[PDB]
Design a protein around this nucleic acid. Structure first.
Lengths: 135, 362, 124, 170, 149
RNA sequence: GUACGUGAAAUUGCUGAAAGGGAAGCAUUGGAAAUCAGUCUUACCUGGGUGAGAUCAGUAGUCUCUCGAGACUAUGCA
RNA sequence: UUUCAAUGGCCCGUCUUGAAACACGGACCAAGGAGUCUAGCAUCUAUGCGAGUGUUUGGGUGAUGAAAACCCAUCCGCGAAGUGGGAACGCCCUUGUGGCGUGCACCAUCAGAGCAUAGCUGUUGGGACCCGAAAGAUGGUGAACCAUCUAGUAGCUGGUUCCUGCCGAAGUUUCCGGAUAGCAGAAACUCAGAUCAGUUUUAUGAGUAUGUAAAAUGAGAGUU
RNA sequence: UUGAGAAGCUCAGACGAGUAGGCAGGCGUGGAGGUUUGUGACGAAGCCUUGGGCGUGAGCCUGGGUCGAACAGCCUCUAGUGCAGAUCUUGGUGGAAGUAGC
RNA sequence: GCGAAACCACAGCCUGGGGAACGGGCCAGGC
RNA sequence: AAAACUUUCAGCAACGGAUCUCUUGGCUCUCGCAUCGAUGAAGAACGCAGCGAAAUGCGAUACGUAAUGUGAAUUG
């Protein structure tokens, strides 16, 4: 369920695996190889990452997030506890309806994994992130 | 992500009108054959009548075990006499007139639940599939002469009263090729199904979707194959028959204008469904060929290796027998001089008397 | 290109010739103390994947063609481009009214028919 | 009808060039050799010339009646009998086409011989006999010069009891 | 569109597919090869060209992505000359800057459709015995009545 | 043909062929006998003659789409 | 296909047993004939939405079957309640080499992930894979007989139905019917610049061997 | 060079016992939705056959005979779905046997 | 003349050896 | 060694009733309704059908009478 193809029957997920299969072997990037591997992963192994974690991780310590795209192979949920949302650019498999509205109205943009492949085909200036699996 | 902006509305005489309708956002929803056929599988089970055997079948008789060691199987045999039942076994699956193993019960789960949001997703994805002519053809519809897909007709169709009025419209928009297909396909069903009020089978014709009824249902219901439905209660059993996407659907102008309120948009809530938004897609543009073969991506890929590669070394050749392979492996065999004369005319016998004495001992 | 068959004899069920109640169709011997399962000397052979035939020549008739079941004229027209690889085989339930029209159509298409002379006579 | 309708996998370029056949050392022209197979099995004949693969061989017509014929070099035993003078007879006319079977042709129209079967017959032309009459003219004096040669070629070779082909020398 | 259409039709269900053991075939009339592939699917290929025969004349059929939602006007048709050399050039001119695989498959179909028409004309000239069906009821009737006779 | 649609297997009778020193028995390889699939030259290339006709006209019309693309009609067959 | 010749070929299943010996079951053929349905629980996968989630007790509605589909008022259930190594990235610049930063998940050192449905698997109840053990009790009929509870009770007996392919034991340490472990797989992790071995050495010691420490040879290894 | 069912095509090397058990892909049966503009009185299904073919196999296709009204391939759904055994159940039928015997 | 039933994997010469009985099947000998 | 007898194969004839096809039957679910008896019920018996195999119908007015409806049958 994780090795050579996703167990998912979603046709559009198969189209993303097809796109990053090409990017993984025709480029010498470990980002395309890492993204392709995480597309085979199951829902349990792709935890959601909150909109607050993205804001915290980008503006952490020295911050200076500049405009690097935050990439997660998973769902970007919303954190209603945080009140001010920074200007963020996140590419994810799925955004919730509240998270997408909060990101857009509070400055920045939301992307899909195929919109980012056209902006950063080698994944340059990308902040690859993950959700905590402790659950 | 780029689709046709508007659709044309056709009149009763099959002629185009100057009016047009913006394409509703439901036709831009993701098309999910996995999700449509999973929801269809559950919904198709929701009108099943229970069946079960009698609660006493195979146990109506009276029998007892004659015993163990009496040169016969220890299954109980019916008592009494005068009838051939004497000695015949029951209360068991193998025995004739016995209890069949695990008798069927009426409280088997006949119906199955689906989340209401998955159901709305499937119906949205099945409506989107009905705007793709290729999906209509692959599902068995004879739409090769239909003027346009989606096929929208005037609202005057909603007040047809006679079937011959409906047949004239289907012939004017070339939609009768599908009805003729359904009429020709009517066969007697195979199997025991025709002993059980399932006498005949046939194909599915166009699905006519109206807004308000003024005779459209009565004028279309007798045409073999055509199903008439209201835009407010669209049915996945009728939008993906058999779980297959791409039903040929004919809309009236009023039904097509009410699709935006029934389904809403991916950002704006549906008017007729409280707190419902159209599903979003994992990919914005679903043409993977366009992304892969794009200038953005093809400019940074390394030079592609060949396609199916040539077979180097199909057969192993021995250099010690094939002189040509030896010449390739060793660029020195051409000048070797294997036999070189060393001892020409000297050959001095080198064995002193001390060595000879030791050798010639005992 | 010649078709090579690793085996031509079928694999019969063990002890199928001693009993009428036991059919010839191959059944794997589940007995542990069975000599056929342990593959002694003189015991019959069993279906193994080693007997599998060449992929290129698999499903090929001895004449080099692959059978294609045909129920009407529309089926035989599909073999317009594949007449050197496939042979038309009219189904057993197709009537003689349609068998003649399939054979005449398959003649112009240059398609071999495996059972073209069935349920019909000739009249020169 | 000409653009290839199928995949038409062209054969890969083979590397099998045709080089001349190397005949045996003892299969020289003018050698008296025994035919091993055919309708003239056992007959002793005289080798005129070596073709590309076969031997253009003939027994004298008046001696054993073996016309100018091709014989495969594997189907011949080359005896060590004294050689015959063959440099005096031209053998350029003995080519592959000279012995080649006449092309099966004839635009026979429907019926008559096509149906009624009034077929024609074959016959050796006098041209073949004319060339043949020359070779025995240039060969008979050669075989008559040495003793027993005329009687040798007339006889037919055979194996008697207690004859071991591997041991006894030809 | 095309990659979504192919996933739905090429892998879930197409009414045109004949599932054979060695290969899948296509019942579509607009398929050049007659096989079920990604490249030869007329439904999943928005730009598609094929050659088919109408009453003895071969035509080049072409469709573009921009006519995909007008089924009556989807396919355009031109006449291919009886001269083979001119017919090949007609496909080359009409299919200019199309992929070389699509022109290759259209010229291959033109050769097979030309041979079939040639073979159809030669069969008409020849005298071939007419195949007459064997009627199971009449055979049984005549066999029984013969025994009585 | 009311021993009644279809009419399997076990089993029985007759007929034919073959085999047969106290088993059959199956497998592997062939022989013999019987019996089958199992097929063919018929087309290509190049003419020339003769006439034929359109997708050819130093041609005229109509219809459906959209100039030119298909369907036909009349005339010529250079 | 039949038959002949040469060579080979102990009757199948069950139980037993290292193995067999066994003892069982098998006159023959046809048809029937055994892990089912359902409630709960847990893992895993898929799907929907996501700090939420679940329409179907019910109401609204559904003219072409109206037991379907479609819609949702109020509740309620379940959830919410600094330093190192490191994925990935940018910048170099002797450029590879490395260095300089930013450092997810997770592990070492001092910024909620659920809920619902479906399937798989395991498990516990119901008759619970099928056939199997004297009954007992209630009520009747003339100690006996009959009907029902009953599908009563089974650790035990016999049986348990298609094919192919790939993995593949153990048959026992240890505590003590067991909890471990071992053996065999699955998943997630970190690593080939790292470790490992029914290995052989070297030498230190200790008493021809011994253990330990550090050269050859082979294999990418360690985990949870 | 056309060889993109990217679920395809292609190249290379190694390897092949197997009980309990683990895993994967397939064959077949009854019924259901879809489909094949499917097959059928010019003969459906079934059965018979020393006819032919396909598959490693489960099985499948087909000729001939018999027969007389229905039936199948593909995608999906579903289950009372596959037998040589249970001193299995029901039915039929044998050797013992024209025997014991009456 | 009328007429069963038990039983029924299949069989049916010995001699030895064949370790587990092995003789009724296996191996070497006779028939 | 041929016959007989035995065995094997095939043909035909028996035996048997499988399979296939269906079917005025069962089973299950849902919906509407409320109607036995001293004014003799349920049940049992005995009779009547020109004959009815039974079975059904009926009660000495006996496979029914009166009345109404359809309008020409009954039937082996």
């Amino acid at each position: 369920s994780q090795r050579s193809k996703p167990a998912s029957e979603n046709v559009y997920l198969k189209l993303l695996v097809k796109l990053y299969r090409f990017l993984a072997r025709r480029t010498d990037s470990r980002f395309n190889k890492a993204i392709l591997k995480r597309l085979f992963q199951s829902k349990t192994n792709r935890p959601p990452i909150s909109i607050s974690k993205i804001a915290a991780l980008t503006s952490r310590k020295s911050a200076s997030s500049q405009n690097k795209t935050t990439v997660v192979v998973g769902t970007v949920t919303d954190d209603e506890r945080m009140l001010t949302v920074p200007k963020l650019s996140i590419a994810a498999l799925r955004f919730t309806k509240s998270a997408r509205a909060r990101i857009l109205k509070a400055g920045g943009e939301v992307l899909t994994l195929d919109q980012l492949a056209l902006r950063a085909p080698t994944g340059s200036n990308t902040v690859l992130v993950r959700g905590k699996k402790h659950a | 992500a780029a689709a046709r902006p508007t659709v044309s509305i056709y009149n009763k005489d099959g002629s185009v009108s100057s009016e047009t309708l913006a394409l509703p956002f439901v036709f831009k929803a993701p098309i999910r054959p996995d999700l449509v056929r999973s929801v269809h599988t559950a919904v198709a089970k929701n009108k099943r009548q229970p069946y079960a055997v009698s609660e006493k079948a195979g146990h109506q008789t009276s029998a007892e075990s004659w015993g163990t060691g009496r040169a016969l199987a220890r299954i109980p045999r019916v008592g009494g006499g005068g009838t051939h039942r004497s000695g015949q076994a029951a209360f068991g699956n193998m025995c004739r007139s016995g209890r069949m193993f695990a008798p069927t019960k009426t409280w088997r789960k006949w119906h199955v639940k689906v989340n209401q949001n998955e159901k709305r997703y499937a119906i949205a994805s099945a409506v989107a599939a009905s705007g793709v002519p290729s999906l209509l053809l692959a599902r068995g519809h004879r739409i090769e002469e239909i003027p346009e897909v989606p096929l929208v007709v005037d609202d005057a169709v909603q007040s047809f009263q006679k079937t011959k009025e409906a047949v004239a419209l289907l012939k004017e928009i070339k939609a009768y090729r599908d009805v003729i297909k359904v009429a020709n396909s009517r066969k007697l069903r195979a199997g025991k199904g025709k002993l059980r009020n399932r006498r005949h089978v046939q194909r599915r014709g166009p699905l006519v979707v109206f807004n308000e009824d003024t005779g459209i249902v009565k004028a279309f219901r007798n045409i073999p194959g055509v199903e008439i439905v209201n835009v407010r209660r669209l049915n996945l059993l009728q939008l993906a028959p058999g779980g297959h996407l791409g039903r040929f659907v004919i809309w009236t102008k009023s039904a097509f204008g009410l699709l935006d309120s029934v389904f809403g948009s991916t950002t704006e809530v549906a008017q007729l469904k409280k707190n419902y938004f159209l599903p979003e897609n994992i990919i914005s543009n679903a043409d993977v060929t366009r992304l892969i073969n794009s200038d953005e991506i093809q400019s940074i890929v390394k030079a592609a290796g060949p396609s199916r590669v040539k077979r180097a070394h199909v057969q192993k050749k021995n250099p010690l027998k094939n002189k040509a392979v030896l010449s390739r492996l060793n660029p020195y065999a051409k000048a070797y001089k294997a036999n070189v004369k060393i001892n020409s005319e000297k050959t001095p016998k080198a064995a002193g008397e001390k060595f000879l004495s030791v050798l010639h001992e005992n | 290109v010649n078709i090579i068959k690793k085996r031509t004899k079928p694999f019969k069920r063990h002890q199928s010739d001693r009993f009428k109640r036991v059919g010839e169709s191959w059944r794997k011997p589940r007995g542990i103390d069975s000599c056929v399962r342990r593959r002694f000397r003189g015991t019959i052979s069993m279906p193994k994947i080693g007997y599998g035939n060449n992929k290129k020549t698999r499903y090929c008739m001895p004449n080099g063609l692959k059978a294609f079941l045909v129920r009407n004229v529309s089926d035989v027209e599909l073999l317009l481009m594949h007449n050197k690889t496939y042979a038309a085989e009219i189904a057993g339930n197709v009537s003689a009214r349609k068998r003649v029209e399939i054979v005449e159509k398959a003649r112009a298409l240059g398609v071999k028919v495996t059972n073209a002379g069935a349920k019909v006579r000739s009249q020169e | 009808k000409y653009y290839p309708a199928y995949r038409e996998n062209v054969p890969k370029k083979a590397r099998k060039a045709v080089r001349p056949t190397k005949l045996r050392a003892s299969l020289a022209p003018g050698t008296v050799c025994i035919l091993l197979a055919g309708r003239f099995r056992g007959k002793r004949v005289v080798v005129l010339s070596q073709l590309e693969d076969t031997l253009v061989v003939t027994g004298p017509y008046k001696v054993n009646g073996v016309p100018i014929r091709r014989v495969n070099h594997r189907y011949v035993i080359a005896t060590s009998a004294p050689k015959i003078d063959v440099s005096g007879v031209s053998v350029e006319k003995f080519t592959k086409a000279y012995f080649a079977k006449q092309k099966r042709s004839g635009p026979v129209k429907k019926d008559e011989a096509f149906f009624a079967e009034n077929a024609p017959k074959n016959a050796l032309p006098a041209e073949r006999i004319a060339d043949q009459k020359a070779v025995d003219a240039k060969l008979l004096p050669a075989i008559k010069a040495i003793p027993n040669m005329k009687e040798y070629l007339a006889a037919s070779f055979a194996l008697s009891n207690g004859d071991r082909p591997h041991l006894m020398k030809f | 569109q095309d990659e979504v259409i192919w996933q739905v039709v090429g892998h879930e269900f197409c009414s045109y597919r004949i599932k054979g053991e060695a290969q899948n075939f296509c019942r579509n009339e607009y398929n050049v090869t007659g096989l079920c592939n990604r490249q030869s699917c007329p439904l999943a290929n928005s730009r598609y060209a094929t050659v088919r025969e109408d009453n003895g004349k071969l035509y080049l059929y072409m469709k573009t992505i921009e006519r995909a939602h007008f089924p009556s006007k989807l396919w355009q048709r031109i006449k291919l000359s009886k001269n083979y050399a001119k017919a090949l050039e007609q496909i080359d001119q009409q299919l200019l800057y199309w992929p070389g695989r699509q022109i290759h498959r259209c010229k291959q179909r033109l050769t097979r459709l030309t041979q079939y028409l040639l073979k159809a004309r030669r069969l008409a000239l020849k005298h071939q015995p007419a195949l007459i069906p064997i009627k199971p009821k009449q055979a049984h009737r005549e066999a029984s009545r013969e025994r009585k006779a």
